[PDB]
């Protein structure tokens, strides 16, 4: 259902920002962006509808899917940056 996708983006962008662990975010991904995700089921249903309803219904699906991707990508890079930074601190030694 087009324009009803805004409830799936809000449910994803808040579940993505809530994850503070790479393992938690890995499960949040497949639930909201995986092959079985509702946002993925909206893209698979773009070749069965007629041609006249394909240029506009897909623009609302691609906009709702790219909005959730950016929230995931920016959250994945953030959590991986914090992980990498913590390794450098934990690996500190007395060089003298």
């Amino acid at each position: 259902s087009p324009e009803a996708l805004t409830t799936a983006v809000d449910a994803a962008q808040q579940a993505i920002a809530l994850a503070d662990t790479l393992d938690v975010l890995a499960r949040v991904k497949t639930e909201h962006l995986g092959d079985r995700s509702p946002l993925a089921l909206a893209r698979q249903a773009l070749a069965v509808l007629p041609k006249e309803q394909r240029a506009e219904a897909g623009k609302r699906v691609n906009a709702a899917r790219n909005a959730a991707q950016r929230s995931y990508d920016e959250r994945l890079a953030t959590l991986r940056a914090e992980r990498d930074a913590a390794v450098l601190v934990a690996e500190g030694i007395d060089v003298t």
């Binding site: 990498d84 390794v87 601190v89 690996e91 500190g92 030694i93 007395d94 060089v95 003298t96």
Partner: protein, 167 residues
């Protein structure tokens, strides 16, 4: 091999690991760096994990022609150990320098052989234990005279790096 004294100091300088990198000084002149390479550099470069590296500028190391004239004392030595608690980020070389500065001329050798952390010590702290060898040049050093030099070494460590004698 160059017959020069060198100090190693904490530093951050790519491609070395910011927590496992030392800058090498001869006197107050920097001559290079050493330590483990940055894990991100290692990953992007396809290098083995944990690869380490060192680079020095030989032309910055002045050629030394020392003519030692050592005087060896044959008198017996006194062996004593001291255990000092400092903040965890106090470099071990600074604690030893402070001990050496307080011990005076009677101190012949100092060697760190234990670095301990745990609930016995407390958080943000670490315990260091040094083996001290005292020796007089003209007499058999007494246990008390050595302890006076040890007490002065402990007092010096307390003033310079905040070392607390362990109890």
């Amino acid at each position: 091999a160059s017959r020069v004294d060198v100090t190693l100091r904490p530093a951050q300088y790519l491609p070395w690991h910011p927590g496992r990198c030392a800058q090498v000084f001869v006197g107050e002149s920097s001559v290079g760096h050493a330590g483990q390479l940055h894990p991100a550099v290692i990953e992007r470069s396809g290098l083995p994990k944990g690869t380490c590296a060192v680079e020095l500028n030989l032309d910055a190391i002045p050629c030394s022609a020392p003519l030692p004239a050592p005087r060896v004392s044959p008198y017996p030595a006194v062996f004593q150990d001291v255990s000092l608690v400092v903040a965890a980020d106090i470099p071990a070389q600074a604690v030893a320098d402070a001990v050496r500065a307080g011990a005076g001329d009677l101190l012949e050798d100092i060697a760190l052989f234990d670095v301990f952390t745990g609930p016995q010590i407390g958080e943000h702290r670490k315990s260091l234990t040094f083996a001290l060898r005292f020796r007089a040049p003209d007499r058999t050093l007494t246990e008390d005279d050595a302890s006076a030099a040890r007490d002065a070494a402990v007092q010096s460590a307390a003033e310079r790096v905040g070392a607390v004698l362990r109890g």
